[PDB]
Nucleic acid binder design. Structure first.
Lengths: 214, 106, 110, 203
RNA sequence: GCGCAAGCUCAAAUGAAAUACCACCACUCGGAACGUUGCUUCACUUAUCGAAUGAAGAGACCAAUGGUUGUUUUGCGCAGU
RNA sequence: CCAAGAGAGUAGCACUGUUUGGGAAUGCAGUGUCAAGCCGGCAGGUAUUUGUCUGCCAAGGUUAAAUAUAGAGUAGGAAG
RNA sequence: CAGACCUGAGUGUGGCAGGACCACCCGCUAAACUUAAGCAUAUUACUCAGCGGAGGAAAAGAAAACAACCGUGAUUCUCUCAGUCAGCGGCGAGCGAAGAGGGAUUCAACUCGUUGCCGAAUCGGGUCUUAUAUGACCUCGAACUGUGGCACCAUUUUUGU
């Protein structure tokens, strides 16, 4: 999918977007990828970070030891700080696991607790694709979260269909299509069977149906 | 086939260790016309195919074909190997049915 | 010819003809053929030529024959031959067996 | 050369179409007596290519031989013996059916020389081979200087000495040296050779 | 967050394990369509097979007919070349 | 102005047996099964795939001479 | 509208075959005794016996070999290797080879079927000529294809058409 043999207009996503209804409501466009055929107890699945230019993803949590530098300073500039104790409390209930993956795109963690952060929160962060990156006491927080913010997650499981959000209608038709293109370009460049087990891909608006890419 | 015969082999230059006995002076072999061996001597194909067409298929051929038609295509692993015998043959059948169908289909 | 000692000997031919997209007829008997050549029977036959004078009729025919043979051939390639029991058995399903009457003998009346 | 077609066509054994042909033949033989002269082969392609070339002296036979294998005949199927060659359907039968067939043709008359023979059919019962047999007496044939070799003293039979290629197959002839070996001087001769005795002139 | 509404949400909340914008890997039946092909009915009569005979009346005879046996000039329908 | 015309239920494979010094198979025979885009086919003594590379081109068809004679060989020598 | 053709009979007509012989051959087939201190595997033996069937010898024979070369070039046979570092094998008993080299012998090599082969089959049988072919003519074997030509070494591949 995504393309046409003489490369004129090229063609599927462009027809789907051009035909697509316009509306005043703020329609997300999400990508539905469908997997089929694999070598199950031979394969390690895909728990992968797909980076998508322009996805509406930027928000983020900073794990530090509790002292003035820079945990107190991060609270007064209104950054969520999660100390070692708080991080353990976050992890358990099924109410909270969904709002952590859904309401954060970047994770930052302190230098003086570097062994401890993999040991504790790593399984949740794995599927998310935005693993905690190092934060020093001299760190600039907005300058460190770069590609984590562009990340969207692929978690294969035995999933024959997961949905991801490739952008909104506020992101151009080139950005939503470039994100599905980029997504396939990451999937191909990350999955061992590339696109052999890629049955179908679709983009769908908030109040639009799903349209297949050929 | 002629993919195996052409200006071969300036063997070199001394015994053992990747080179051996004498820096050849590789005579002009092989004008070997038994490379006539079938090829697509057009005749072969032509006939074979007509008749091939004329006869339809075999039960099996069809059988495997079914498998394809579904896509049980590691199957026939067996059919081709056992039925035809040997791994090459297997390959050979495999093409053979498959092709015929695939283009047949258009 | 459709009457020949191995039919196998010639079997590929209509097909071939068809392949060569040439006019081909399914013609009866070896014997008469034999006779135009004066042999006891005769085996395969074609015209390359004649004289033009004779052509027109030939042409008419050729079309029909091919129409009856090549153009349809494929269809003929669908259409199987054979299957046939004795008479008796026809008569049977027509009769004592399957059509004595209303059926085999079932309901005629209503 | 039409045979080119013929041959391939002829390879199509395993099919319905053939099996028609086969079937008629399979009623025909099945109706029919054991060994018959033919006014032409039913498989000309092999025949001509195993050499049939249209004139007298060339004689055609169709021949019926029971297939299967065989028992070791023993009265009442009893062997005393040490174990080894045992079983009712024991020793399997070295000579080939074709060969027997030819040979039986060889026995069948007081003339014919198998030029060769090919299988035409087999059923559940009989193998049919169509046998190209020659008489070596026709004056034209005898006249024929191409074939006249056939006439000669070595030809007081052939088939039972194992002279067809097939016979020669069971007779084992392959020129592949280390798969040619032993039989190359017959079975026996070589044995005689190989187990020679101390003929040393001097010592 | 969603939408016409708005319900549930979300962002409550517990338990053993949690959902609207909702993309889905978790049984089971369910079908024709999906034409194929597998085992199966029971259809049949032509291979085979048993018997029988110097192969001595198979079928076409029954009601007012059959023959859907046809084959078939011929017709119409269709469809096609 | 190009052609370029080489062996099938055989080859093969299974299976069985038999057979071989020949070994994860030397053959053969039976039975079943059953091959060639021809970038082919056959061979290259550890099974295989897998790939090269190396040697040939089978499966129809004829062919002195140099050898034998081995017990029972026949014409005509030579002998111990 | 009408009588074949085709096949299978029966004659006539001309051959052939049998059985011999069978030392050696050529096929085929195919013991046990023995040994293993037993013995079944093994061995004997792929021998005996049996059977078929030839010759003056037969057999074999012209690459789907050998190789691993500085290469070889039908077969056969001999010598050789090697009773072996090939090896098989109650792995024991017992078994067990090839290649090459030297060498003898040899100037040994050969066809058809898939190639346009084709102005009444170029053929063959018969006939009749010619003193044989040839000539000739039928017969009618033969266009279900015999001839010729050509035969994956070539033809010059290929292109100098």
């Amino acid at each position: 999918m995504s393309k046409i043999p003489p490369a004129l207009l090229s063609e599927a996503i462009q027809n789907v977007l051009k035909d697509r209804k316009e509306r005043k409501f703020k329609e997300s466009i999400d990508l539905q990828v469908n997997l089929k055929n694999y070598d199950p107890q031979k394969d390690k699945r895909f728990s992968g970070s797909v980076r998508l230019p322009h996805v509406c993803r930027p928000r983020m949590t900073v794990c530090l030891l509790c002292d003035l530098v820079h945990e107190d300073i991060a609270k007064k500039n209104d950054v969520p700080t999660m100390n070692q104790e708080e991080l353990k409390k976050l992890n358990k209930n099924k109410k909270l696991v969904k709002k952590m993956c859904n309401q954060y795109d970047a994770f930052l963690c302190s230098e003086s607790i570097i062994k401890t952060v993999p040991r504790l929160v790593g399984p949740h962060m794995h599927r998310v694709g935005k693993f905690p990156t190092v934060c020093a006491q001299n760190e600039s927080l907005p300058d460190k979260v770069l590609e984590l913010q562009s990340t969207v997650k692929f978690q294969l499981k035995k999933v024959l269909c997961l949905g991801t959000c490739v952008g909104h209608v506020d992101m151009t038709e080139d950005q939503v299509r470039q994100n599905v293109v980029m997504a396939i370009n990451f999937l191909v460049s990350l999955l061992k069977k590339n696109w052999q087990n890629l049955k179908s891909a679709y983009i769908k608006s908030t109040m639009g149906k799903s349209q297949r890419i050929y | 086939a002629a993919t195996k015969r052409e200006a071969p082999v300036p063997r070199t230059g001394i015994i053992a260790g990747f080179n051996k006995g004498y820096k050849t002076t590789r005579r002009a072999r092989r004008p070997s016309s038994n490379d006539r061996y079938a090829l697509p001597h057009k005749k072969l194909r032509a006939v074979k195919a007509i008749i091939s067409d004329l006869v339809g298929f075999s039960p099996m051929e069809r059988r495997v074909q079914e498998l394809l038609r579904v896509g049980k295509d590691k199957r026939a692993l067996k059919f081709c190997k056992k039925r035809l015998g040997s791994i090459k043959a297997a390959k050979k059948r495999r093409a053979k049915v498959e092709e015929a169908l695939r283009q047949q289909t258009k | 010819a459709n009457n020949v000692d191995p039919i196998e000997l010639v079997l590929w031919m209509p097909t071939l003809c068809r392949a060569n997209k040439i006019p081909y007829a399914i013609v009866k008997d070896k014997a008469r053929l034999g006779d135009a050549i004066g042999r006891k029977t005769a085996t395969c036959v074609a015209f390359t030529d004649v004289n033009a004078e004779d052509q027109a009729a030939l042409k008419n025919l050729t079309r029909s024959v091919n129409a009856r043979f090549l153009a349809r051939s494929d269809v003929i390639r669908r259409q199987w031959g054979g299957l046939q029991l004795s008479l008796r058995s026809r008569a049977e399903l027509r009769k004592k067996r399957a059509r004595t009457a209303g059926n085999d003998a079932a309901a005629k009346a209503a | 050369g039409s045979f080119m077609y013929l041959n391939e066509l002829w390879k199509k054994k395993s099919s319905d179409v053939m099996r028609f042909i086969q079937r008629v033949r399979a009623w025909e033989f099945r109706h029919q007596h054991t060994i018959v002269r033919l006014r032409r082969p039913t498989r000309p392609e092999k025949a001509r290519m195993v050499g049939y070339k249209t004139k007298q002296g060339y004689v055609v036979f169709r021949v019926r031989v029971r297939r299967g294998g065989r028992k070791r005949p023993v009265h009442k199927g009893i062997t005393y013996g040490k174990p080894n060659t045992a079983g009712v359907l024991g020793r399997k039968l070295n000579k080939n059916n074709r060969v027997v067939a030819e040979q039986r043709l060889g026995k069948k008359y007081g003339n014919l020389r198998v030029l060769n023979s090919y299988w035409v059919n087999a059923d559940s019962t009989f193998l049919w081979y169509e046998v190209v047999a020659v008489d070596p007496m026709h004056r034209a044939i005898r006249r024929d200087p191409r074939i006249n070799w056939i006439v000669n003293a070595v030809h007081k039979h052939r088939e039972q000495r194992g002279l067809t290629s097939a016979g020669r197959k069971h007779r084992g002839l392959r020129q592949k040296g280390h798969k040619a070996s032993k039989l190359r001087p017959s079975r026996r001769a070589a044995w005689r050779r190989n187990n020679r005795m101390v003929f040393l002139r001097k010592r």
